[PDB]
Amino acid sequence: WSKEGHVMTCRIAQGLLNDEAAHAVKMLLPEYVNGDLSALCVWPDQVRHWYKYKWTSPLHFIDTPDKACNFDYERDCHDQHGVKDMCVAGAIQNFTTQLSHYREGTSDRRYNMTEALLFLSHFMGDIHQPMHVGFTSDAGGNSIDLRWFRHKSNLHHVWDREIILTAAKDYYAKDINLLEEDIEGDFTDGIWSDDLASWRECGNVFSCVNKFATESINIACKWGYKGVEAGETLSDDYFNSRLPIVMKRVAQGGIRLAMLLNNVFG
Amino acid sequence: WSKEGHVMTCRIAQGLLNDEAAHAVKMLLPEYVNGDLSALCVWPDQVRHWYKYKWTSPLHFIDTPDKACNFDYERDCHDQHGVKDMCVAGAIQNFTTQLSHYREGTYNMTEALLFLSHFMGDIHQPMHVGFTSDAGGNSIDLRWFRHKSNLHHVWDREIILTAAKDYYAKDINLLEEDIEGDFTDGECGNVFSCVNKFATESINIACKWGYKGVEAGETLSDDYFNSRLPIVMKRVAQGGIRLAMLLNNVF
Ligand SMILES: *[C@@H]1O[C@H](CO)[C@@H](O[C@@H]2O[C@H](CO)[C@@H](O[C@@H]3O[C@H](CO[C@H]4O[C@H](CO)[C@@H](O)[C@H](O)[C@@H]4O)[C@@H](O)[C@H](O[C@H]4O[C@H](CO)[C@@H](O)[C@H](O)[C@@H]4O)[C@@H]3O)[C@H](O)[C@H]2NC(C)=O)[C@H](O)[C@H]1NC(C)=O
Ligand SMILES: *[C@@H]1O[C@H](CO)[C@@H](O[C@@H]2O[C@H](CO)[C@@H](O[C@@H]3O[C@H](CO[C@H]4O[C@H](CO)[C@@H](O)[C@H](O)[C@@H]4O)[C@@H](O)[C@H](O[C@H]4O[C@H](CO)[C@@H](O)[C@H](O)[C@@H]4O)[C@@H]3O)[C@H](O)[C@H]2NC(C)=O)[C@H](O)[C@H]1NC(C)=O
Ligand SMILES: *[C@@H]1O[C@H](CO)[C@@H](O[C@@H]2O[C@H](CO)[C@@H](O[C@@H]3O[C@H](CO)[C@@H](O)[C@H](O[C@H]4O[C@H](CO)[C@@H](O)[C@H](O)[C@@H]4O)[C@@H]3O)[C@H](O)[C@H]2NC(C)=O)[C@H](O)[C@H]1NC(C)=O
Ligand SMILES: *[C@@H]1O[C@H](CO)[C@@H](O[C@@H]2O[C@H](CO)[C@@H](O)[C@H](O)[C@H]2NC(C)=O)[C@H](O)[C@H]1NC(C)=O
Ligand SMILES: [Cl-]
Ligand SMILES: [Cl-]
Ligand code: NA
Ligand SMILES: [Zn+2]
Ligand SMILES: [Zn+2]
Ligand SMILES: [Zn+2]
Ligand SMILES: [Zn+2]
Ligand SMILES: [Zn+2]
Ligand SMILES: [Zn+2]
């Protein structure tokens, strides 16, 4: 996601933390964000360019083969040079494990738990963004130039940001907090209120990340790539049919991130 | 150490405490641990990740120059940016001094105790006083029997867990009681020289027994376990005896 998908994913998660998770997160954050996890959830997108963290660059996405329309861990979860686990599914296992050590203390210098938290948070959002688990050849739609309403864009960015911005502008006065509260409502009192247990119950971590990836690639083929040709214009119909899917994936990432943090600390 | 080495170090100390040091420790500890210091001496390993206590991070160890195979306080006792005393040797002195003010009433004393007890353990862990380029073995990746591990972790935990499961039905308490009995049945000038000695013992062991024979990517099993185990038990005992020493003098 661009900034807004991450901020929403993480504010939703933070307001659903249990007391032990809430506390750990508060202790792990710098004083300057005043307890707000969401103030830092886009941090990995900035630092992936830093030499020190260039190893984090393939952890943002999954490349699945063109047209295959499924996800297979062994086949897909590696960077370009075939190094194992270097995809957003592997990243989530990794940093979830690191955080499980914090609780007992039993770890050493190799791991920085503030970075473990921010990475896990970020990457739980990214795996929920369908176009982050899209095709290898178009790099999750980045190569597919197109027009979003009146301006130039690409299919990846339509999912990372344009759909979110158009919704914010059209219905919520450009105020992401209000879009976020609508998403809260839809899972507190609304259309998704009876699905939270099913969203939360995905087996062990390895099993959860396969399920999140699968959902993502599945949506990429059915809703992302589908109906979209390079150079064409996407407007009302595509927005109207896809906004609910974007909103849902923002919700699911928040709930599931809350779920991991609650299990790893509590 | 990981948790079990700290808990053992601290239980062995509390039972060697004179009446003044014991009463001190009871008054500084929170209601909820019911007088059990060991219940809280892994605390520094949690709080080192907290923003509020970032500065405690380098106090867990000492990085000595690769192959040098010796310790020197002015050469070594600093963080990665040169700030002096920011090493486990510096921290033990720091927190000794702080606790000297507890009786007089003349700094948070609960924290000083927990940091002291913890760090007296860590200085005794040989690999907390190892080389700088592999971070005290942390980046020497290997196998401990079947398990993916690293050399640093072999000493923090693997050797202790493996002796626990093998000889004590996984019960740390029985292993402790056997270290207590074996190394309690038969002093330095100041605290500065005390910590120098502890630190030098640990660097020596690291060279002779930690790093020696160990190849990256290789499996350590019965031979390395059998031979190093009694070195690990000694260090646990030494740590706990000497920590009782300091607490006894300061209180
Ligand atoms: C000198 O230094 C020490 C350590 O840095 C400080 O002591 C800490 O002080 C805080 C209070 O500010 C303590 O934190 C609190 O501990 C309570 C104790 O409960 C324990 O036992 C129950 C079961 O009986 C467990 O369930 C629980 O997890 C604890 O292990 C907690 O009940 C408190 O919880 C409340 O606050 C937190 C966060 O604010 C919320 O998440 C909770 O919902 C709840 O509202 C709290 O966690 C801490 O234990 C102390 N640590 C130690 C090592 O003693 C001293 O305060 C400091 N001295 C001075 C003068 O400032
Ligand atoms: C575990 O990992 C985390 C994350 O990697 C580390 O946390 C970072 O620690 C550094 C300290 O090295 C923090 O960097 C400093 O942050 C200060 C505050 O930044 C905020 O406010 C400023 C302006 O008011 C904004 O510009 C900024 O966006 C922030 O909102 C700054 O004051 C510092 O900047 C100045 O000093 C440095 C020199 O230290 C110069 O290089 C700079 O150019 C500048 O002049 C500085 O950047 C950083 O914010 C922390 N990040 C996070 C996410 O927490 C932990 O330290 C690490 N733990 C261990 C043990 O290593
Ligand atoms: C002895 O114990 C005492 C605690 O009782 C302990 O004092 C602490 O020392 C640290 C230094 O490591 C102090 O933290 C510093 O705060 C000042 C501002 O007042 C800053 O100058 C320092 O900035 C550094 O760290 C920044 C944050 O990451 C970096 O951005 C920057 O580059 C600097 O490197 C640093 O934050 C801490 O506040 C005191 N606390 C108290 C209560 O005095 C002391 O370190 C102990 N020493 C040993 C050897 O055990
Ligand atoms: C698990 O997290 C750690 C960071 O704590 C990563 O460790 C790095 O691994 C790469 C190998 O690709 C090395 O180049 C770096 O030097 C390592 N850094 C450290 C600090 O150990 C590791 O890549 C992570 N794995 C996954 C799948 O996320
Ligand atoms: Cl940073
Ligand atoms: Cl605490
Ligand atoms: Na030096
Ligand atoms: Zn993103
Ligand atoms: Zn993206
Ligand atoms: Zn990202
Ligand atoms: Zn330790
Ligand atoms: Zn260690
Ligand atoms: Zn430690």
**Is A19 one of the annotated binding-site residues?**
no
**Is A237 one of the annotated binding-site residues?**
no
* Cross-strand bridge partners of residue A145: A154
Nearest CA in chain A to B5: A106
Q: Which residues are CB-neighbours of A7 under 8 A, at least 6 positions away? A: A38, A41, A42, A176, A180
Three-state secondary structure readout of B153-208: HHHHHHHHHHHHHHHHCCCHHHHHHHHHHHCCCCCCCCHHHHHHHHHHHHHHHHHH
Q: Could you tell me which residues of B are annotated as the binding site for Zn(2+)?
A: 1, 6, 45, 60, 118, 122, 128, 152, 156
The amino acid at B217: G
How far are the Cα atoms of A115, B86, B127 from residue B134, in angstroms, in the given order?
A: 21, 19, 10
Residues A261 and A13: beta-carbon distance below 8 Å: yes
Contacts of B138 in chain A (CB under 8 A): 108-110
What is the distance between the alpha carbons of residues B3 and B40, in angstroms, rounded to a whole number?
A: 10
Pick from A104, A106, A113: which is nearest to B49 by CB? A113
What is the distance between the alpha carbons of residues A97 and B30, in angstroms, rounded to a whole number?
A: 30
| Closest ligand 1 atom to A23 CA | 41
Pick from A27, A102, A106: which is nearest to B2 by CB? A106
Nearest CA in chain A to B122: A108
Q: What is the pairing mode between strands B147-150 and A151-154?
A: unpaired
Residue B251 DSSP code: -
What is the distance between the alpha carbons of residues B97 and A174, in angstroms, rounded to a whole number?
A: 57
The arrangement of secondary structure in A1-266, i.e. its CATH architecture, is Orthogonal Bundle (1.10)
Touching A: B residues 157-216, CB under 8 Å? 157
Residues A35 and B52: beta-carbon distance below 8 Å: no
* Cross-strand bridge partners of residue B78: B84
Laid out side by side, the sheet with A151-154 consists of A151-154, A145-148, A233-234
Q: Which residues are CB-neighbours of B130 under 8 A, at least 6 positions away? A: B63, B64, B136, B137, B152, B203, B206, B210, B211
| Closest ligand 2 atom to A47 CA | 5
Distance B57 CA to ligand 5 centre (A): 17
Chain A CB within 8 Å of residue B49 CB:
yes
Q: Which residues are CB-neighbours of A153 under 8 A, at least 6 positions away? A: A145, A146, A147, A162
- Dig out the tokens for A53 from the structure: 């963290």
| Closest ligand 1 atom to B109 CA | 1
Chain A CB within 8 Å of residue B128 CB:
no
Kindly state the helix (H) or strand (E) to which residue B96 belongs, with its residue range.
helix B88-100
Alpha-carbon torsion B136, B139, B142, B148, what sign? positive
Domain B1-251 falls in which CATH fold?
P1 Nuclease (1.10.575)
Pick from A27, A105, A110: which is nearest to B45 by CB? A105
| H helices present in chain A, as ranges | 3-14, 19-28, 43-47, 73-76, 88-104, 113-128, 155-157, 163-172, 176-188, 196-200, 205-219, 236-265
Nearest CA in chain A to B57: A109
| Straight-line distance from the first to the last Cα atom of chain B, in angstroms, rounded to the nearest whole number | 26
Question: Which protein residue's CA is at the shortest distance from atom 20 of ligand 4?
Answer: A110
What is the distance between the alpha carbons of residues B159 and B236, in angstroms, rounded to a whole number?
A: 12
Ligand 3-lining residues (CB < 6 angstroms)? B 54-55, 59, 85-86, 90-91, 94, 107
Question: Which protein residue's CA is at the shortest distance from atom 5 of ligand 2?
Answer: A115
The experimental technique used to determine this model is: X-ray
Residues B61 and B128: beta-carbon distance below 8 Å: yes
Candidates A70, A90, A71; CA nearest to A82 is: A90
Radius of gyration of chain B (CA): 18
Residues A21 and A261: beta-carbon distance below 8 Å: yes
